[PDB]
Enzyme design. Structure first.
Site, PDB file in Angstrom:
ATOM      1  N   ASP C 113      -4.768 -21.903   5.163  1.00 15.12           N
ATOM      2  CA  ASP C 113      -3.719 -22.573   4.394  1.00 15.12           C
ATOM      3  C   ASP C 113      -3.952 -22.386   2.905  1.00 15.12           C
ATOM      4  O   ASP C 113      -5.096 -22.333   2.465  1.00 15.12           O
ATOM      5  CB  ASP C 113      -3.774 -24.064   4.735  1.00 15.12           C
ATOM      6  CG  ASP C 113      -2.469 -24.782   4.469  1.00 15.12           C
ATOM      7  OD1 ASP C 113      -2.143 -25.702   5.236  1.00 15.12           O
ATOM      8  OD2 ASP C 113      -1.790 -24.452   3.488  1.00 15.12           O
ATOM      9  N   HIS C 115      -3.102 -24.676   1.019  1.00 12.81           N
ATOM     10  CA  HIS C 115      -3.252 -26.081   0.638  1.00 12.81           C
ATOM     11  C   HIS C 115      -4.262 -26.810   1.517  1.00 12.81           C
ATOM     12  O   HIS C 115      -4.620 -26.338   2.594  1.00 12.81           O
ATOM     13  CB  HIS C 115      -1.905 -26.802   0.728  1.00 12.81           C
ATOM     14  CG  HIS C 115      -0.772 -26.038   0.116  1.00 12.81           C
ATOM     15  ND1 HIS C 115       0.059 -25.224   0.855  1.00 12.81           N
ATOM     16  CD2 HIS C 115      -0.344 -25.949  -1.165  1.00 12.81           C
ATOM     17  CE1 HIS C 115       0.960 -24.678   0.058  1.00 12.81           C
ATOM     18  NE2 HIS C 115       0.732 -25.096  -1.174  1.00 12.81           N
ATOM     19  N   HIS C 130       3.339 -33.593   5.965  1.00 16.08           N
ATOM     20  CA  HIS C 130       2.703 -32.298   6.179  1.00 16.08           C
ATOM     21  C   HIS C 130       1.620 -32.011   5.129  1.00 16.08           C
ATOM     22  O   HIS C 130       0.801 -31.105   5.299  1.00 16.08           O
ATOM     23  CB  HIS C 130       3.730 -31.158   6.259  1.00 16.08           C
ATOM     24  CG  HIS C 130       4.295 -30.748   4.935  1.00 16.08           C
ATOM     25  ND1 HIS C 130       4.812 -29.490   4.706  1.00 16.08           N
ATOM     26  CD2 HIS C 130       4.433 -31.430   3.772  1.00 16.08           C
ATOM     27  CE1 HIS C 130       5.229 -29.410   3.454  1.00 16.08           C
ATOM     28  NE2 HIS C 130       5.013 -30.573   2.868  1.00 16.08           N
ATOM     29  N   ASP C 220      -1.192 -21.945   8.752  1.00 14.11           N
ATOM     30  CA  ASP C 220      -0.040 -22.169   7.890  1.00 14.11           C
ATOM     31  C   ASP C 220       0.257 -20.836   7.201  1.00 14.11           C
ATOM     32  O   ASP C 220      -0.591 -20.288   6.499  1.00 14.11           O
ATOM     33  CB  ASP C 220      -0.360 -23.262   6.859  1.00 14.11           C
ATOM     34  CG  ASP C 220       0.802 -23.549   5.915  1.00 14.11           C
ATOM     35  OD1 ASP C 220       1.712 -22.703   5.801  1.00 14.11           O
ATOM     36  OD2 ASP C 220       0.794 -24.614   5.263  1.00 14.11           O
ATOM     37  N   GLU C 265       5.005 -23.636   9.434  1.00 11.73           N
ATOM     38  CA  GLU C 265       5.640 -23.471   8.122  1.00 11.73           C
ATOM     39  C   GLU C 265       6.425 -22.176   7.931  1.00 11.73           C
ATOM     40  O   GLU C 265       6.828 -21.852   6.806  1.00 11.73           O
ATOM     41  CB  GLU C 265       4.643 -23.677   6.974  1.00 11.73           C
ATOM     42  CG  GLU C 265       3.946 -25.046   6.974  1.00 11.73           C
ATOM     43  CD  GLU C 265       4.856 -26.193   6.552  1.00 11.73           C
ATOM     44  OE1 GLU C 265       6.029 -25.938   6.201  1.00 11.73           O
ATOM     45  OE2 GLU C 265       4.393 -27.357   6.562  1.00 11.73           O
TER      46      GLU C 265
HETATM   47  N1  FB5 Z   1      -0.077 -31.533  -1.613  1.00 12.13           N
HETATM   48  C1  FB5 Z   1       1.368 -31.416  -1.769  1.00 12.13           C
HETATM   49  C2  FB5 Z   1       2.095 -30.328  -0.958  1.00 12.13           C
HETATM   50  C3  FB5 Z   1       1.538 -30.040   0.425  1.00 12.13           C
HETATM   51  C4  FB5 Z   1       1.881 -28.703   1.057  1.00 12.13           C
HETATM   52  C5  FB5 Z   1       1.960 -28.666   2.559  1.00 12.13           C
HETATM   53  B1  FB5 Z   1       1.608 -27.278   3.255  1.00 12.13           B
HETATM   54  O1  FB5 Z   1       0.307 -26.985   3.578  1.00 12.13           O
HETATM   55  O2  FB5 Z   1       2.626 -26.412   3.550  1.00 12.13           O
HETATM   56  C6  FB5 Z   1       1.728 -32.634  -0.873  1.00 12.13           C
HETATM   57  O3  FB5 Z   1       2.872 -32.805  -0.470  1.00 12.13           O
HETATM   58  O4  FB5 Z   1       0.742 -33.539  -0.532  1.00 12.13           O
HETATM   59  C7  FB5 Z   1       1.967 -31.960  -3.046  1.00 12.13           C
HETATM   60  F1  FB5 Z   1       1.671 -31.208  -4.106  1.00 12.13           F
HETATM   61  F2  FB5 Z   1       3.264 -32.235  -2.937  1.00 12.13           F
HETATM   62 MN    MN Z   2      -0.261 -26.666   5.735  1.00  6.43          MN
HETATM   63 MN    MN Z   3       0.366 -24.790   3.057  1.00  2.52          MN
END
Ligand code: FB5
Ligand code: MN
Ligand code: MN
Ligand code: FB5
Ligand code: FB5
Ligand code: MN
Ligand code: MN
Ligand code: MN
Ligand code: MN
Lengths: 308, 308, 308
Positions: C113, C115, C130, C220, C265
């Site tokens: 991922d 993130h 998510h 992801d 995703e």
């Molecule tokens: N961390 C963020 C985005 C998370 C991304 C999800 B993913 O892995 O596709 C959140 O919503 O907690 C934030 F910046 F908005």
């Molecule tokens: Mn994710």
């Molecule tokens: Mn992501």
């Protein structure tokens, strides 16, 4: 954690206008907000205003500008602030490096660039000063430079205390100058063979074996591939990618010895938009042009910005 | 430092026309000027003119063409010139490699390609010869080929003396042929795991442990990713990048043992413009299409072109 | 060699619609044909249908959906089939991982991922689930979650048995959570420094020193750079390239210990066409959008698809 910001909108070292707008563009895009969020305090000094060689273009303007930048930056360095010099074309690195060197005699310079900028006036194909700035800084010029009299008694940078990283577009005469002066250089091929991480570690070990010297970073944004940094005047294929340039800045930050830095050759008029993706999380203006945004991110890296 | 230039505009090994224009296009883009600036002398020979398997398309044209190329190239090789064979589709490598092999019995072949080209007529999905050329060259064909009688008494290439580099798009039967004939191969995954530098060093050590064999390079430009080399008929995702292909050619040049080379599958009609950036410094036509320009740069690498 | 296919078109974990179409899109693009050609048998189960925290958006829908997915997947896992869970946003990984973990107590999770997805409701900038799913799965939530009562007595995933790979866009609070819970993570900078191959080997050695644990892959698709995977809702610059993500999946396949996987995703509505090149050889629909095609290729890698 104090940074002095100097805007050096000199555009006389190369044909084009555009780079003169870089300093104010980076401010507009959120330079102050970026520095603030990283826990640094800033002092924005504003913008610098503005027997012999007879073949350097625009040399009067360059010489007069350089004296002003030298005096202004010397004053900022004495505060023991980190000094961030935002060009402008690469011509601004002469006064930047030499002012820093007079204060930090054991300065080590990391020159990050697609090009050598190591032409001397008698070998230059263009007569453009920004293609000679490193040669000038290293004391390689053989004659006097008009309007640089103020600089004649300065201590010059030594090739053995310098590393050039990312080079790939070098003129015929430059190739000879590079080898002759014994500067340390690391081409895009060295980077492809060993990786950016091993390359910078090798460079730092070579110029600073005892890891005890102050470091000056002179970053020409055209070291970065056109895909990520279209906003620049002189493009060369096969540059540093986004991950590489970010990692490079991160590693230099982590020495904890960077005292000053140039960021040069950003030309907003040539830049393009992506744009806004979620990953643009630094307090940088939404939908900013990509090279400008990259410049702010690289400045952030130097100020300690990291993934986790 | 003498190079014979042979144009081999054979387009009968695959469906499309376009590759027949490659030889003259590279000349137009500055092939001679490029060779001149690198300190080599050239002799441009011009262009080649033009119980049994019954399922190879266009085989008559291919067979007749190949005899002509074999005879012409044999004559150039005997001069002890470096011989540069510009296709044309990959079908031209049969006569190129075999002529070079008859003169240099200990030839080692580096086949740089997204594909294996190692189908035999009974396994080919297409009946297109350019997808079988390596299998043919290695003596893997089981029946006689119409119009190739002239070739029946030649010494064929051995799999153990060959390395395929850059492969990523291999047919089901080809996978079996590859493993069975014991050829040395290095996929894009091997390259991703170890890097292009380690990969070519490993290949050279494997096929030429004593570093004393003449080398033939058969470069199919579709080994390079589409981003850099769109001008080609059969594209496969995830190819060699600009830095990698340049480094690869540089390393091969530095063996000092390359005696001959194919550059095949360049199709100008499919190519695109960037274009002109300062880094395009070789005497190559301004704003040339990008694949054509890359081809000239890779030829330059083989002739010793380097960053510094 | 039996795979259960579960479609989990949950789109309630993030603002956008689009990911709900991913499951049926991958089927349309040739999921069954791809599995068939790799010598696997499939059972397509179809699509899942559909003191306390008060600040998680759409939590009712998510909770109800998750119970259904948990029960359905538990039943598939008991067959000892490989289970492929196609989202949907990353919210579907909670029930996927926990169902797999109840059966395989020594499960090791590879979370791929851009993130962290490691926010807790009190630190989330968005309130989007998510972005919290991994934190939830690791037992990091401090209060009860509405409509998740069914899950309260489950065994949760342990940070030390997890590796996050490819991260580059992490929120301020997330950085603290990441360090605090002692999860194993490998950023894009670690990948740039060591390469994807060394990185995954290091991760596997760290979480499974004896190479004897079942593996769950939670992929992801936004871990992959936008150039290759535009079809996704939250993009972060400097992602895994095409070669890297393919190699990563290949290495995980080669452990022979992968028991379950999420692919999440993918948003067809955001995807783009290239398109059709010869290298698209898997039985995938001609001219399919590029992210969808990549998803099928990565699933193929996990099922043993290799270059030769
Ligand atoms: N961390 C963020 C985005 C998370 C991304 C999800 B993913 O892995 O596709 C959140 O919503 O907690 C934030 F910046 F908005
Ligand atoms: Mn994710
Ligand atoms: Mn992501
Ligand atoms: N070497 C050149 C270009 C230098 C590029 C400057 B830069 O680093 O942005 C020169 O002008 O001396 C030559 F080719 F014109
Ligand atoms: N293997 C293929 C394509 C070969 C590509 C030739 B090349 O190297 O440019 C074949 O024709 O045998 C098949 F898929 F059609
Ligand atoms: Mn420069
Ligand atoms: Mn430059
Ligand atoms: Mn070929
Ligand atoms: Mn090919």
């Amino acid at each position: 954690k104090n940074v002095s910001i100097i805007g050096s909108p000199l555009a006389a070292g190369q044909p084009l206008g555009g780079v003169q707008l870089a300093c104010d563009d980076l401010r507009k895009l959120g330079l102050h907000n970026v520095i603030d969020v990283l826990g640094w305090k800033y002092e924005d000094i504003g913008n610098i205003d503005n027997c012999y060689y007879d073949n350097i273009r625009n040399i009067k303007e360059i010489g007069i500008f350089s004296k002003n930048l030298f005096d202004t930056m010397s004053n900022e360095l004495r505060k023991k602030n980190f000094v961030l010099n935002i060009g402008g074309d690469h011509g601004v690195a002469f006064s930047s490096i030499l002012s820093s060197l007079q204060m930090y005699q054991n300065l080590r310079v990391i020159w990050i660039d697609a090009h050598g900028d190591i032409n001397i006036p008698e070998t230059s194909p263009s007569g453009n000063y920004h293609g000679m700035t490193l040669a000038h800084t290293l004391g390689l010029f053989k004659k006097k430079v008009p309007y640089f009299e103020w600089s004649e008694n300065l201590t010059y940078l030594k090739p053995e205390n310098t590393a050039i990283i990312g080079i790939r577009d070098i003129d015929a005469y430059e190739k000879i100058i590079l080898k002759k002066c014994n500067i340390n250089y690391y081409t895009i091929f060295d980077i492809e063979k060993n990786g950016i991480y091993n390359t910078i570690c090798t460079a730092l070990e070579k110029i600073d074996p005892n890891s005890n010297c102050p470091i000056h970073i002179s970053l020409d944004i055209d070291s970065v591939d056109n895909v990520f940094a279209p906003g620049t005047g002189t493009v060369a294929k096969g540059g540093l990618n986004y991950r590489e340039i970010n990692l490079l800045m991160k590693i230099l930050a982590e020495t904890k010895r960077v005292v000053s830095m140039d960021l040069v050759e950003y030309n907003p008029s040539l830049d393009e938009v992506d744009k806004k993706v979620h990953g643009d999380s630094l307090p940088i203006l939404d939908n900013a042009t990509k090279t400008g945004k990259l410049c702010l991110e690289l400045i952030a890296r130097v100020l300690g910005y990291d993934i986790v």
